[PDB]
Amino acid sequence: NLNETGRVLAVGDGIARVFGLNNIQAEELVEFSSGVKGMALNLEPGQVGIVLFGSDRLVKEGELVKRTGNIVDVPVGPGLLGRVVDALGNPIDGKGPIDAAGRSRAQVKAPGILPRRSVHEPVQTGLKAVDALVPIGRGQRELIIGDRQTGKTAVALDTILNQKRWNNGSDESKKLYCVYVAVGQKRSTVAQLVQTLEQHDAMKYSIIVAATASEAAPLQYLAPFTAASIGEWFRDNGKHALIVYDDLSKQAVAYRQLSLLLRRPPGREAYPGDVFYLHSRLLERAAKLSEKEGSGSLTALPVIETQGGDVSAYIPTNVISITDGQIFLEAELFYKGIRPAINVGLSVSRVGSAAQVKALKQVAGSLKLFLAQYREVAAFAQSDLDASTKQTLVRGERLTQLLKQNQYSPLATEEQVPLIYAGVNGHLDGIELSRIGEFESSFLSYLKSNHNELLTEIREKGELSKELLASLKSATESFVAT
Amino acid sequence: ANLNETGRVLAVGDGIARVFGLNNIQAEELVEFSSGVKGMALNLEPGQVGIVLFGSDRLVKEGELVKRTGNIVDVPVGPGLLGRVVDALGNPIDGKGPIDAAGRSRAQVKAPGILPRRSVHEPVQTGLKAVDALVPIGRGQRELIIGDRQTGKTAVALDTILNQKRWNNGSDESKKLYCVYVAVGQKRSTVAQLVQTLEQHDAMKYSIIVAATASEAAPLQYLAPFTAASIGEWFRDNGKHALIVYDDLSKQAVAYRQLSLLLRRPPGREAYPGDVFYLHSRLLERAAKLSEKEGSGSLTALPVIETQGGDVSAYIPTNVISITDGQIFLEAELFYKGIRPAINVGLSVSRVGSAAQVKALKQVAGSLKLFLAQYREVAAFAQSDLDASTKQTLVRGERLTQLLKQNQYSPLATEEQVPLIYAGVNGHLDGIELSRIGEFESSFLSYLKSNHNELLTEIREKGELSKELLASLKSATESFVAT
Amino acid sequence: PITGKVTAVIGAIVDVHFEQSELPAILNALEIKTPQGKLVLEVAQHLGENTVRTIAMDGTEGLVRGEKVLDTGGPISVPVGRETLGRIINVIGEPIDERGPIKSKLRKPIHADPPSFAEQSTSAEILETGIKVVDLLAPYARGGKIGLFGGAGVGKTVFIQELINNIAKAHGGFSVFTGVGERTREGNDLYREMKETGVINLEGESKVALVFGQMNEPPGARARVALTGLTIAEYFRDEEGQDVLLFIDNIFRFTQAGSEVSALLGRIPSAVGYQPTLATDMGLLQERITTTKKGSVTSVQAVYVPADDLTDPAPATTFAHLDATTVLSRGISELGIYPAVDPLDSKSRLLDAAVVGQEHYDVASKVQETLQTYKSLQDIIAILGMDELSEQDKLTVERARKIQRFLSQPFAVAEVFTGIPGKLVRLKDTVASFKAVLEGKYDNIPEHAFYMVGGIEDVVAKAEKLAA
């Protein structure tokens, strides 16, 4: 044929160089005699460079190669919920075929300037530190960043566990469907993540997309894009999705493998000069659509692993400047007891208040301050200290202690506000530093026993009247003395 | 279809045009492309010629005709270039007609050897108290002006040029000093404003501007200092004296690194090519004081180098230090405090300038250099004890520091400099408040002009201070100090 | 029309083959028809053998070897003139706001030579902004470049929008805002806010043109957007003789795009990974922003500093072209001072007796010394009290408190958010008003009378209301 078919010139390191395929499309999927697939990234004058999806032991020089006529795509739709798929949307969970609503390309234009609307609805993570200090809105990109083993995945996972509060209800505009993208991780780790979602009945509204460490580099490079299409089905249909990219560091590294083996020019850290574009194409797909276009949402929590805390390395630089803010984790805090290990001074949400439940905003406003003032005077923590700085130390320590939170234990907003209210207003100052944990427990159950009406008003109205404030004040003062 | 006198473009890209033919071409010959853009034959290979463009790649296409010129890259030279602004190839860019040229010199001219030279012994009077007294410059010397962004580098050079108005309006040719200012990589608006400054001070009539600005292609930036040097060399070769300011070599070296990387020459330190020292060395060696046999002309060079964060240890800065005959280092910290010129006295040096310093200055500036560079070390240790001996040197140093401050565009005559230094060094300013030192100068010069004009004239005409004249300086000072 | 064929696709790099001696000039725009709209390629090199290498302005997924390629005959061109006002435009000049086509009278190429040496203005001169702090302490150069520093939460967009408003009302000049590597979320916010503020009016007349080169566009697009925005701005200067504003947010992002393009073309990178043409790339953009005999383009450019390293190639090269800086600071807004301009950090080359006059300079210099002595004394105030101060010192500190508050100003554009009618203070008034304070002619006036007002007459007016 020479137009729809090709002969293998050479093959090695996951690359196969092919003669012919004259009518092929850039980034088109192809199929080799042996059954393995791959995509045509380089179209050159007399040959085509194809990256393979599988072992090259299967490809030989001289072997026939066929077009498929299809740019890479993936099945999409609600049929995927509770399923575990690979980068092309094949079921890997032993649960049978996927029912797709349709198919979507891996590469899709992000919504433009015009069809969007300011981020204004919360993604309630359930984490006191985050929701109060680094609030995330629907359609925002908030990066989770830090060294190995600092709790980056835990933040994402807690956010996914939390969504039950609304996914179990019938109001679809409040629901958050979750897409978790495992890139470069080991299978058992993913298997364990799945078992964990299952135990907290969170799989049923989650989709796992897995391109693990042993899978070919093109599959790891595709998996974020594929997953975004899966999430875009929700966004495009007046629903709301959250996507976790865990992680974009390892995705960059797969793209760098293909780029170097196709002999494209290297730059800083041997990344190709379109590695920025790779991640910006991916992340601008997270958006909050306008009313005209159904008000649907996609919210991204990309993960980046730093090396020795170095945010200046090439990939962290890229992603940091693309997203809307950073949640920064640190080992030092982790060992201190501070978990989740969020460095508050370095974390931000560019969206800010707009994405916060008003109730939480009414108490979180002054929390940001008391902590700022606490970080300046931190060193003064060792005999001759005046009135004001001794006080800043007393609040600071207790407010810091309130933000400690166990894994897999996300808290409702109405549980969050009384705790921060108590802290910020001084009701904790008298209580000794080691008892703040037991205080939280007892105070919540006391409120559920005796003041459930106030909890209910917080949850339902999302705001705090001057009447609520005074009721809270009374309930807090009442419990402190007991 | 002369493919001996003519070429066809094979490929154009990255500021290189690959051309087929041109078989009779010389290495480093100028060529002309169909569109009018000019290039330089850089490497002659079997089968093709590689040509560096003096313009945009846009201006050249595959299959276009290229013509030989028969000349190595060259420029118009001669006295007629005075009061003219031109580009790197000597093309006039100020709208004033064609250049009146005495002839043409190549861009790359070899520097005079060991024999044709003679030690520097004639002053370049800058008009700056801090420079003339502490880091004097000889005709034929090379003195680096180096420091961070926005520290007053150009101002030192420009004040030096304005000062020459003193002799250049006169009759005596040996005393004259013609100026060549080379703008490499600067904004056009900066250069046009600088020219307007020179016209406003009547200094344009004796100087030549050569401009390769920030939007111009890299080879014209690389080129401008060399052609400017040949324009400088004419005066040198014909028994006259030129001053040449290369503003600045930092930006030249950035331009050369662009060609080198596009030509794929291996990057070394900070990605410069192995030959970036040579770029500056062959250029600066052309500034020289010639012997009596060669006509006694001279070319003095004031190159500018920009540091980053006041770091002089860096590659380009140290290459140039190891070429020139001393440096004037301008310090950001001094500049910020309002000490301007911001000369850091301990880091500045003139390697060969003493022999050329006007004797009157030399006499009243005894040890001043060593002293100031020492005061700063006593100042730093002051911020432990109110020691008697050190408190006096702290009182002198502050006065002397204030005394060396000088406004821009306000260069002083040597006869005006000597009495101020005299009053400082000898302690006559010791009883005067710090805030009135500026007021002292203007009042003291008026006094000397109105009253003891006879002393000022003698200093000017003799350049030395006899015992008699020194004692007459002592009276005039003390009387004024009193009142 | 001239026709080529695609011979190679590698990511955003595309190679096109044309017929004998029919090759398009480097920087010509080529066009491929797509089911969506059109893919534009810009010619980068002539490879030999009748093949050109190009950089794509959009994605190349789907391209096939042999596809028909059209040569438009020139560089990328953009619609220019009054018809661009209130429209959102992309790098290739298409409208991206769904308001139909820009029925412009001309299109102009985005690549053009800077005004000639002989065409340059010979004297620096001030562009009067009507903002007190700026005009007094760090005045903008007409036809110059101003580094705008400060991220979010400092009223940056309101500051930009007041310059747009003030230049139009004071000098009758339009503005062009160019988002280079702008977050799409923030272009949507900026557009929605310009309509709320009045600087864009769909039903009426707008004052600013928006050109956006989104982060998710390929490097070639993000590298050229600045030139697209600039050309619209240039037309107002050359054709209509206006003093124009050009906003570039962020100039660092224009640098990185150029690094990325260069890398993609196979050029060997220079120090710190930047493109070898770093300085000339910067000069080909910056040199076009300048004053001519017809009028002027003045550019306000948001500057990002990598790693906070001012010696990094990108800021160091950018800074060579800056004539002033406006520093917006959280420390100033936390004190309740709007615009949140740091009066000490903000510096201008044109703060000189030669350019602004002796009085202007002397007034400005004294103000700076006052605030500087105030800053240093902050420490002993916080612990010892105001009792430990000399007569000359306690007076200047009292005066500093007033000067500080007098540097604040209500903005006309912010009236929708605040309810406070905005003021545009003239340079002549700003100089006189502060001069009168420095001599001590308003020492008996309470501190709150200097807060959020216009000229000196507004101070006298308010003081009479706050007493009686």
Ligand SMILES: Nc1ncnc2c1ncn2[C@@H]1O[C@H](COP(=O)(O)OP(=O)(O)NP(=O)(O)O)[C@@H](O)[C@H]1O
């Ligand atoms: N809030 C928490 N409280 C207590 N332990 C926690 C918390 N969050 C995380 N951990 C534990 O800390 C360890 C690191 O958590 P994990 O979420 O895996 O971090 P990570 O940065 O993604 N690690 P890796 O991806 O393997 O580099 C795990 O053992 C967690 O179970």
Ligand SMILES: Nc1ncnc2c1ncn2[C@@H]1O[C@H](COP(=O)(O)OP(=O)(O)NP(=O)(O)O)[C@@H](O)[C@H]1O
């Ligand atoms: N002696 C002086 N007194 C007062 N101001 C001065 C003096 N010398 C220079 N300046 C001013 O300081 C600023 C910088 O001077 P300039 O000579 O441009 O330094 P530079 O190091 O060449 N700057 P650049 O080339 O931009 O890095 C200008 O605004 C000058 O007018």
Ligand SMILES: [Mg+2]
């Ligand atoms: Mg993990």
Ligand SMILES: [Mg+2]
């Ligand atoms: Mg300079």
